[PDB]
Amino acid sequence: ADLRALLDEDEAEMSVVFSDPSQPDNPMIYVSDAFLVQTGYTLEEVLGRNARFLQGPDTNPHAVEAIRQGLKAETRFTIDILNYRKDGSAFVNRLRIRPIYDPEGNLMFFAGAQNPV
Amino acid sequence: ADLRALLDEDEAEMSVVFSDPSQPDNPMIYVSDAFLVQTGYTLEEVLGRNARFLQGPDTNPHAVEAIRQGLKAETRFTIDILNYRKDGSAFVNRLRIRPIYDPEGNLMFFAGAQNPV
Numbered sequence: 717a718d719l720r721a722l723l724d725e726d727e728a729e730m731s732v733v734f735s736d737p738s739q740p741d742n743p744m745i746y747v748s749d750a751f752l753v754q755t756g757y758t759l760e761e762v763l764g765r766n767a768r769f770l771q772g773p774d775t776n777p778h779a780v781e782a783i784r785q786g787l788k789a790e791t792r793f794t795i796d797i798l799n800y801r802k803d804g805s806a807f808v809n810r811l812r813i814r815p816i817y818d819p820e821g822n823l824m825f826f827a828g829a830q831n832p833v
Numbered sequence: 834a835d836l837r838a839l840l841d842e843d844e845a846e847m848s849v850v851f852s853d854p855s856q857p858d859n860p861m862i863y864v865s866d867a868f869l870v871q872t873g874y875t876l877e878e879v880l881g882r883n884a885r886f887l888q889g890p891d892t893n894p895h896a897v898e899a900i901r902q903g904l905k906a907e908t909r910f911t912i913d914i915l916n917y918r919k920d921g922s923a924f925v926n927r928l929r930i931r932p933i934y935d936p937e938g939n940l941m942f943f944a945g946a947q948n949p950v
């Protein structure tokens with residue numbers, strides 16, 4: 717069950733995760749294999765968790781709060797945020813987030829794509 | 834966002850709904866257009882509701898309880914149950930339900946297919 721199949725025909729992204737905002741702490745319910753391999757985590761380490769663990773020692777905490785407010789807004793947004801892989805290595809992530817809507821316009825999931833730049 | 838894209842390549846079903854068991858009353862979060870058209874409901878009338886409203890005056894209540902227990906079991910099952918469209922017309926539904934799993938084997942959704950027989 718590849719939830720990337722819910723994204724548009726135009727969009728083709730490797731590292732993608734899907735979260736469920738109706739569950740406590742907005743946990744990830746699906747991650748692509750590219751997400752796992754690029755970060756170095758196993759499924760057991762990430763499923764059911766909020767994606768904020770990609771942050772680390774030099775991440776700007778206001779960038780973190782920006783993402784939280786953007787999610788509350790249920791809109792498309794992109795932000796350059798310093799992130800980290802399981803092994804501690806750092807990268808600038810051009811993080812792209814978009815709400816995924818049901819056919820009636822209700823929020824179903826958030827999709828978020830990781831893009832090292 | 835067509836959640837039927839999460840089903841297997843081998844399966845091709847028209848009327849399909851997806852429910853979220855982590856939400857109160859296991860509501861439907863996605864219904865195919867075929868489900869809406871065959872039952873005669875609009876999106877507003879079904880999204881966010883448990884699918885038990887396809888039952889009606891002559892439905893066997895033990896068949897209903899069978900489905901509830903089958904869902905608790907998180908397994909594939911099929912049952913012939915008397916169901917009803919929005920206009921009150923009755924049909925025998927060969928209802929097919931299967932759990933939809935995340936890559937780690939955790940339950941994500943239930944998928945249920947309606948098949949008038």
Ligand SMILES: Cc1cc2nc3c(=O)[nH]c(=O)nc-3n(C[C@H](O)[C@H](O)[C@H](O)COP(=O)(O)O)c2cc1C
Nearest residue numbers: 733735766767768770771780783784826827828830
């Ligand atoms: C689908 C999705 C993907 C996300 N991906 C990332 C990510 O790649 N990197 C990151 O730093 N935060 C990411 N976040 C943001 C965190 O999950 C979290 O919302 C953020 O840190 C703000 O909330 P907090 O202050 O409670 O941590 C993502 C959020 C969602 C919903």
Ligand SMILES: Cc1cc2nc3c(=O)[nH]c(=O)nc-3n(C[C@H](O)[C@H](O)[C@H](O)COP(=O)(O)O)c2cc1C
Nearest residue numbers: 850852883884885887888897900901943944945947
């Ligand atoms: C994905 C899904 C599809 C379902 N489709 C039907 C259906 O087509 N007809 C039906 O009578 N019940 C259907 N059900 C069963 C009802 O939602 C409900 O679980 C059942 O009536 C037993 O629970 P209750 O005793 O609380 O009503 C479906 C359940 C799920 C999770």
